[PDB]
Amino acid sequence: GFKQDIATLRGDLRTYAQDIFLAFLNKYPDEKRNFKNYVGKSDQELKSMAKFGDHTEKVFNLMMEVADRATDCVPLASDASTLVQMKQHSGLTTGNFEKLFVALVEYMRASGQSFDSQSWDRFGKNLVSALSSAGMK
Ligand code: HEM
Ligand SMILES: CC1=CCC(=C(C)C)CC1
Numbered sequence: 001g002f003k004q005d006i007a008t009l010r011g012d013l014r015t016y017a018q019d020i021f022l023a024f025l026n027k028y029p030d031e032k033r034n035f036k037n038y039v040g041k042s043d044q045e046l047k048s049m050a051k052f053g054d055h056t057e058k059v060f061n062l063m064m065e066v067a068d069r070a071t072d073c074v075p076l077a078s079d080a081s082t083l084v085q086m087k088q089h090s091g092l093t094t095g096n097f098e099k100l101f102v103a104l105v106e107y108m109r110a111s112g113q114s115f116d117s118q119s120w121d122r123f124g125k126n127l128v129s130a131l132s133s134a135g136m137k
Contacts, residue, residue, distance in 0.1 A: 002119035005108075006067050009060070017060035018047055024103035031099060034091060066127070073123040080130035093137050094128045101127070 009016045022043050025032055032039050038046055046052045066079040083089060101124025108115035 001116045002067070002070075002073060002123070005115050005120070006064050008113070008115070010064055013060055013064070014053065014057050017056045018053060020104050020107050021056045021059070021100075022046065023107045024100050027103045027106070028099045031096065034096065067123060070123065070126075073119050074126045075123070075130050077130060077134065080127065080134040083127075084131055084134040084136045089136075094131050097124070097128050097131055097136075101125075 025035075025038065025046075026043075037049075037051065041049070066075050066083075069076050069079060101120065105117050105121045105124065108117040108120055
Protein backbone atom coordinates (compact mmCIF):
# COMPACT_ATOMS: atom_id res chain seq x y z
CA GLY A 1 0.00 0.00 0.00
CA PHE A 2 0.87 3.65 0.47
CA LYS A 3 3.13 3.21 3.55
CA GLN A 4 5.10 0.38 1.95
CA ASP A 5 5.45 2.57 -1.20
CA ILE A 6 7.08 5.29 0.99
CA ALA A 7 9.60 2.62 2.19
CA THR A 8 10.24 1.40 -1.41
CA LEU A 9 10.87 4.96 -2.70
CA ARG A 10 13.09 5.83 0.30
CA GLY A 11 15.15 2.65 -0.35
CA ASP A 12 16.44 4.14 -3.66
CA LEU A 13 15.27 7.72 -3.29
CA ARG A 14 17.95 9.51 -5.41
CA THR A 15 17.06 7.26 -8.41
CA TYR A 16 13.23 7.46 -7.99
CA ALA A 17 13.35 11.24 -7.36
CA GLN A 18 15.38 11.90 -10.56
CA ASP A 19 13.31 9.45 -12.68
CA ILE A 20 9.95 10.86 -11.47
CA PHE A 21 11.07 14.51 -11.77
CA LEU A 22 12.38 13.81 -15.33
CA ALA A 23 9.00 12.17 -16.17
CA PHE A 24 7.34 15.42 -14.88
CA LEU A 25 9.61 17.81 -16.90
CA ASN A 26 9.30 15.69 -20.14
CA LYS A 27 5.48 15.34 -19.84
CA TYR A 28 5.10 19.12 -19.13
CA PRO A 29 8.01 20.80 -20.95
CA ASP A 30 6.57 24.29 -20.07
CA GLU A 31 7.35 23.49 -16.33
CA LYS A 32 11.09 23.91 -17.24
CA ARG A 33 10.24 27.70 -17.00
CA ASN A 34 10.44 27.38 -13.11
CA PHE A 35 13.94 25.76 -13.55
CA LYS A 36 15.49 27.88 -16.38
CA ASN A 37 18.95 26.14 -15.84
CA TYR A 38 17.40 22.74 -16.90
CA VAL A 39 16.42 23.99 -20.45
CA GLY A 40 18.21 22.44 -23.50
CA LYS A 41 19.46 19.47 -21.43
CA SER A 42 18.97 15.72 -22.08
CA ASP A 43 18.02 13.54 -19.09
CA GLN A 44 21.68 12.27 -18.76
CA GLU A 45 22.96 15.92 -18.81
CA LEU A 46 20.52 16.85 -15.97
CA LYS A 47 21.56 13.75 -13.90
CA SER A 48 25.27 14.80 -14.20
CA MET A 49 24.45 18.29 -12.76
CA ALA A 50 24.88 19.05 -8.99
CA LYS A 51 21.80 21.31 -8.44
CA PHE A 52 19.66 18.69 -10.23
CA GLY A 53 20.45 15.61 -8.13
CA ASP A 54 20.70 17.53 -4.80
CA HIS A 55 17.52 19.66 -5.31
CA THR A 56 15.34 16.79 -6.72
CA GLU A 57 16.41 14.51 -3.84
CA LYS A 58 15.58 17.26 -1.27
CA VAL A 59 12.13 17.67 -2.91
CA PHE A 60 11.45 13.91 -2.52
CA ASN A 61 12.98 13.73 1.00
CA LEU A 62 10.28 16.24 2.07
CA MET A 63 7.56 14.70 -0.15
CA MET A 64 8.10 11.33 1.60
CA GLU A 65 7.94 13.02 5.06
CA VAL A 66 4.63 14.70 4.06
CA ALA A 67 3.36 11.29 2.76
CA ASP A 68 4.55 9.58 6.00
CA ARG A 69 2.80 12.16 8.25
CA ALA A 70 -0.51 11.81 6.26
CA THR A 71 -3.59 9.93 7.53
CA ASP A 72 -5.43 8.00 4.77
CA CYS A 73 -3.46 10.00 2.12
CA VAL A 74 -4.56 13.33 3.71
CA PRO A 75 -1.52 15.52 4.49
CA LEU A 76 -1.14 17.63 7.65
CA ALA A 77 -2.34 21.24 7.20
CA SER A 78 1.05 22.31 8.75
CA ASP A 79 2.91 20.49 5.89
CA ALA A 80 0.63 22.23 3.33
CA SER A 81 1.33 25.66 4.93
CA THR A 82 5.14 25.01 4.86
CA LEU A 83 4.97 24.13 1.12
CA VAL A 84 2.90 27.32 0.31
CA GLN A 85 5.07 29.68 2.49
CA MET A 86 8.50 28.44 1.24
CA LYS A 87 10.29 31.37 -0.57
CA GLN A 88 11.32 28.85 -3.30
CA HIS A 89 7.55 28.28 -4.18
CA SER A 90 6.57 32.04 -4.34
CA GLY A 91 6.06 31.63 -8.14
CA LEU A 92 3.89 28.46 -8.07
CA THR A 93 0.15 27.57 -8.43
CA THR A 94 -1.65 24.32 -7.55
CA GLY A 95 -1.39 23.32 -11.28
CA ASN A 96 2.40 22.90 -10.85
CA PHE A 97 1.74 20.36 -8.05
CA GLU A 98 -1.20 18.82 -10.06
CA LYS A 99 1.19 18.01 -12.94
CA LEU A 100 3.99 16.63 -10.71
CA PHE A 101 1.53 14.13 -9.21
CA VAL A 102 -0.01 13.16 -12.59
CA ALA A 103 3.55 12.30 -13.73
CA LEU A 104 4.33 10.42 -10.47
CA VAL A 105 1.12 8.35 -10.75
CA GLU A 106 1.79 7.60 -14.48
CA TYR A 107 5.40 6.61 -13.58
CA MET A 108 4.09 4.18 -10.93
CA ARG A 109 1.43 2.73 -13.34
CA ALA A 110 4.16 2.14 -16.02
CA SER A 111 6.67 0.63 -13.51
CA GLY A 112 7.11 -3.11 -13.17
CA GLN A 113 6.08 -2.74 -9.46
CA SER A 114 3.04 -3.10 -7.15
CA PHE A 115 2.88 0.64 -6.23
CA ASP A 116 -0.55 1.65 -4.84
CA SER A 117 -0.98 4.21 -7.68
CA GLN A 118 -4.63 4.96 -6.59
CA SER A 119 -3.38 6.06 -3.11
CA TRP A 120 -0.70 8.35 -4.68
CA ASP A 121 -3.38 9.92 -6.99
CA ARG A 122 -5.62 10.60 -3.91
CA PHE A 123 -2.55 11.92 -2.00
CA GLY A 124 -1.82 14.32 -4.93
CA LYS A 125 -5.49 15.49 -5.05
CA ASN A 126 -5.59 15.92 -1.22
CA LEU A 127 -2.27 17.84 -1.22
CA VAL A 128 -3.53 20.16 -4.00
CA SER A 129 -6.75 20.70 -1.90
CA ALA A 130 -4.64 21.37 1.24
CA LEU A 131 -2.35 23.81 -0.72
CA SER A 132 -5.46 25.73 -2.05
CA SER A 133 -6.84 25.81 1.55
CA ALA A 134 -3.45 27.11 2.86
CA GLY A 135 -3.48 30.00 0.23
CA MET A 136 -1.83 28.88 -3.06
CA LYS A 137 -3.75 30.18 -6.17
C1 HEM B 1 5.23 17.74 -2.70
C2 HEM B 1 5.84 18.44 -3.65
C3 HEM B 1 7.06 19.25 -3.43
C4 HEM B 1 7.94 19.26 -2.38
C5 HEM B 1 7.95 18.35 -1.19
C6 HEM B 1 8.89 20.30 -2.65
C7 HEM B 1 9.98 20.57 -1.81
C8 HEM B 1 10.97 21.48 -2.09
C9 HEM B 1 12.17 21.64 -1.36
C10 HEM B 1 12.60 20.89 -0.11
C11 HEM B 1 12.87 22.62 -1.97
C12 HEM B 1 14.22 23.11 -1.51
C13 HEM B 1 15.34 22.22 -2.08
C14 HEM B 1 16.68 22.92 -2.17
O1 HEM B 1 16.77 24.18 -2.07
O2 HEM B 1 17.71 22.22 -2.36
C15 HEM B 1 12.12 23.08 -3.08
C16 HEM B 1 12.54 24.09 -3.95
C17 HEM B 1 11.88 24.35 -5.12
N1 HEM B 1 10.75 23.76 -5.55
FE1 HEM B 1 9.67 22.50 -4.61
N2 HEM B 1 8.61 20.89 -3.80
C18 HEM B 1 7.51 20.33 -4.33
C19 HEM B 1 6.85 20.65 -5.53
C20 HEM B 1 7.31 21.60 -6.43
C21 HEM B 1 6.77 21.85 -7.70
C22 HEM B 1 5.55 21.14 -8.26
C23 HEM B 1 7.52 22.85 -8.30
C24 HEM B 1 7.41 23.48 -9.64
C25 HEM B 1 6.58 23.05 -10.58
C26 HEM B 1 8.54 23.15 -7.38
C27 HEM B 1 9.46 24.11 -7.62
C28 HEM B 1 10.49 24.34 -6.74
C29 HEM B 1 11.49 25.33 -7.13
C30 HEM B 1 11.52 26.15 -8.41
C31 HEM B 1 12.39 25.33 -6.14
C32 HEM B 1 13.63 26.20 -6.09
C33 HEM B 1 14.45 26.17 -7.38
C34 HEM B 1 15.84 25.68 -7.08
O3 HEM B 1 15.94 24.54 -6.57
O4 HEM B 1 16.85 26.38 -7.32
N3 HEM B 1 8.40 22.38 -6.25
N4 HEM B 1 10.96 22.36 -3.14
C1 LIG C 1 13.69 22.57 -5.05
C2 LIG C 1 14.00 21.90 -6.34
C3 LIG C 1 15.20 21.65 -6.67
C4 LIG C 1 15.60 20.84 -7.84
C5 LIG C 1 14.60 20.52 -8.72
C6 LIG C 1 14.90 19.78 -9.66
C7 LIG C 1 13.95 19.44 -10.74
C8 LIG C 1 16.28 19.26 -9.88
C9 LIG C 1 13.28 21.23 -8.54
C10 LIG C 1 12.85 21.45 -7.16
